[PDB]
Amino acid sequence: GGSGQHCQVEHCRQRDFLPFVCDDCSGIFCLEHRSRESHGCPEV
Ligand SMILES: [Zn+2]
Ligand SMILES: [Zn+2]
Numbered sequence: 001g002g003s004g005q006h007c008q009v010e011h012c013r014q015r016d017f018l019p020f021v022c023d024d025c026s027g028i029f030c031l032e033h034r035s036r037e038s039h040g041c042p043e044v
Contacts, residue, residue: 009038 005019006012008027018031024042034044 009033011038
């Protein structure tokens with residue numbers, strides 16, 4: 001929207017994404033990124 005929230009994973013793209021933050025991991029996460037498991041969520 002305005003440089004407010006961006007996927008923690010630097011590898012992620014710049015294009016718009018799904019603003020999904022992890023309860024345990026404050027870092028921003030995407031809906032698709034989950035399937036990739038690039039972040040390695042503790043509850044995933
Ligand atoms: Zn992402
Ligand atoms: Zn997480």
